[PDB]
Design an enzyme around this catalytic site. Sequence first.
Site, mmCIF file in Angstrom:
data_model
loop_
_atom_site.group_PDB
_atom_site.id
_atom_site.type_symbol
_atom_site.label_atom_id
_atom_site.label_comp_id
_atom_site.label_asym_id
_atom_site.label_seq_id
_atom_site.Cartn_x
_atom_site.Cartn_y
_atom_site.Cartn_z
ATOM 1 N N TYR B 25 -95.462 35.151 21.468
ATOM 2 C CA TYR B 25 -95.240 35.426 22.908
ATOM 3 C C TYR B 25 -95.862 36.785 23.223
ATOM 4 C CZ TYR B 25 -92.814 34.827 27.391
ATOM 5 O OH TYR B 25 -92.515 34.687 28.715
ATOM 6 N N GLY B 26 -97.006 37.066 22.588
ATOM 7 C CA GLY B 26 -97.755 38.325 22.735
ATOM 8 C C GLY B 26 -98.741 38.253 23.884
ATOM 9 N N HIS B 107 -108.687 31.660 17.958
ATOM 10 C CA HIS B 107 -109.726 32.463 17.262
ATOM 11 C C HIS B 107 -110.087 31.739 15.964
ATOM 12 C CE1 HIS B 107 -112.175 35.741 16.050
ATOM 13 N NE2 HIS B 107 -111.266 36.413 15.342
ATOM 14 N N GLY B 133 -104.542 38.572 28.130
ATOM 15 C CA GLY B 133 -103.441 37.804 28.738
ATOM 16 C C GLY B 133 -103.292 38.041 30.229
#
Lengths: 340, 343
Positions: B25-26, B107, B133
């Site tokens: 949740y970054g 990635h 984000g």
Amino acid sequence: NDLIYQDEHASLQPLEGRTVAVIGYGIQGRAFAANLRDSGVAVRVGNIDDRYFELARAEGHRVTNIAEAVAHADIVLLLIPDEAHGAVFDVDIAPNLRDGALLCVAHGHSLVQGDVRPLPGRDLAMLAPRMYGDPIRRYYLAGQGAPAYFDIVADHTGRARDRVLAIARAVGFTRAGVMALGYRQETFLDLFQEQFLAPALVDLVETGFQVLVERGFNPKAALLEVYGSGEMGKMMLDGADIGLDEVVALQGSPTCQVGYHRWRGRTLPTAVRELAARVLDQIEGGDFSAYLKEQASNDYASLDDARRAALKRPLNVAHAQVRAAFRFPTEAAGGLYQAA
Amino acid sequence: NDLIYQDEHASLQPLEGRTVAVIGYGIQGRAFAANLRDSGVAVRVGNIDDRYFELARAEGHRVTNIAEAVAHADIVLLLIPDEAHGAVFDVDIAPNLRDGALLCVAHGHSLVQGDVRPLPGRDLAMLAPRMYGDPIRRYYLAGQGAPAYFDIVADHTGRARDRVLAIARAVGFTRAGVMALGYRQETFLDLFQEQFLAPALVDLVETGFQVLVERGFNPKAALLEVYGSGEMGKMMLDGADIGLDEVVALQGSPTCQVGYHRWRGRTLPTAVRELAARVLDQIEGGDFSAYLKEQASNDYASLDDARRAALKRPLNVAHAQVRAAFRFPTEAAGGLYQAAQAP
Ligand SMILES: NC(=O)c1ccc[n+]([C@@H]2O[C@H](COP(=O)([O-])OP(=O)(O)OC[C@H]3O[C@@H](n4cnc5c(N)ncnc54)[C@H](O)[C@@H]3O)[C@@H](O)[C@H]2O)c1
Ligand SMILES: NC(=O)c1ccc[n+]([C@@H]2O[C@H](COP(=O)([O-])OP(=O)(O)OC[C@H]3O[C@@H](n4cnc5c(N)ncnc54)[C@H](O)[C@@H]3O)[C@@H](O)[C@H]2O)c1
Ligand SMILES: [Mg+2]
Ligand SMILES: [Mg+2]
Ligand SMILES: [Mg+2]
Ligand SMILES: [Mg+2]
């Protein structure tokens, strides 16, 4: 120490019953004219017979030749190209600038070169925005502003300072901050940004693109990564807020941060710093002034050739292909400069 | 020859009655979770016991450990740091990933190193945004999007492609464009941006600041001109839209354009492109991969020192002085990741 004016340090009181002649309706002229009008300041546009005259009329302004605008104004904003200042000042402005009137330039160059000079009985100032027109206008409509530098060069009236800062408040610069800075230092700072920094940033983006293409990378992906995605632009603009190293700390994956910090401070040889010094010497020593005067004659024909040549560079050919295939986030600009 | 998907080339149909587990949740996790939820997709967050676990709960998500999130999901997005992929994949994901479920990385690095591998009966893909984000979230809410690359690594189901592009549409990437690109090439491109271009751009901004300050220019004014005003940022962002040379042609005074074209293509010595090649060699050859695992093995202790050391640099001292004295135009970010409507 530094003298920085914000909204609490300026008022529109000095512009009560005064007419501002905005001379020019280009990148700066259009934004000053729009912002002044929306701030409830009486504004006239003075322009030569070109597309900008017609645009000013289309956007509901009172538009005349420069001489007529100056004659009917208490404050004159000279927002035309710097090389045009000399002739327009001598022929159109100086003879028509009323007793006790204020003349403002948005760049110190014409003051440094002596093309614009103090006039007996009249005020002379620089109010130099640190931003181009579209953002100045968009910021203003969102209750925001861009920073500016100001210099009171000649103050016969003793009221130049408050009149300059009233213009700065009306156009929105005091929402960010309007800092006292000499017209000479502004000229050299401003030309340095245009001649070293901007070219070197674009040169570096282009270098990343060319090396990736040379080594078999997808040209569209190469173009997107080096700037086309908007990521490098977002990093630089968010960086203006929180700091560039801080953007990487906050918005970078640990993989990104580890890689960034491996090469941070190690990418540029001493030659880059030395070329920056060389550019500044050219700006200060009269070399650039001579180059600019040359380029100006024949209505900047050389500049037109340079503009058309740039579009055919691999980076800009790749940009066209990317922008045709990828939709970029944009805001509607229709009627951006029409009355609020 | 490029394969580029926009809204007309994808639908949300493949996510009907499916649960997406967002692992992390970054920077990426928060944006995917928020956009997926607003697009009407069933989302759950799998996260370790840290501040991101509490943030996910605070922002109204169903939050559990990683293993439980994976066990109840049809699609899993592995949005945690690349060096954590190996252990989390082996212990938390691989044993709990349902038959016919899809695993996505954002990635290629974990795929190139073999830390994330195809599993029998399951789908494996890369969906790699070309953006961090906050803009992914802001663009989404404006009915816009960030670009992305994708690669279908393993497709047991034969429906991996449409499910990946359905996630991409749900998070808004198809409003810009989602291009097919191999996970290997994405890895090298992405690491090159991070190791050559970003450092060199900031190094160049810093060079401009240092030279002006060393020659007696007002430090606040020097800082504003080289980036602090937002002008170079706006030029580079507007440049992404219309082209960098085109921004100068449209928004530059003739004085500015004459100065720009005097030095354009002449500012950099050949050593810069040589370093660009050297960085790619380190990225492609395994040098960086080894350097990253060394940095991660101590929970990024060296990075923490580097971050603190960077704040002491004159550029960042000047930044703080400028930011205390000049108000900067910013949008309020308070509600940014809380529930919204589909645009
Ligand atoms: N562009 C910027 O970002 C920026 C930033 C701050 C300050 N400035 C300064 O503002 C002033 C105006 O620059 P700009 O970028 O708006 O330029 P611009 O190229 O947009 O100027 C076009 C305007 O100038 C008029 N003009 C052009 N040649 C003329 C001539 N020979 N005689 C009379 N009018 C003429 C046109 O009719 C039009 O109104 C300059 O002093 C510039 O240095 C520009
Ligand atoms: N940051 C970007 O701009 C960006 C762009 C595209 C792709 N990516 C990729 O997205 C993925 C996530 O990157 P990010 O930038 O969101 O990272 P981040 O630093 O924001 O990740 C933080 C998240 O990872 C979790 N986490 C950290 N260490 C963990 C561990 N050992 N085990 C389990 N969970 C752990 C945290 O609890 C939190 O949820 C990576 O694969 C990255 O390469 C990042
Ligand atoms: Mg400028
Ligand atoms: Mg990355
Ligand atoms: Mg990236
Ligand atoms: Mg200028």
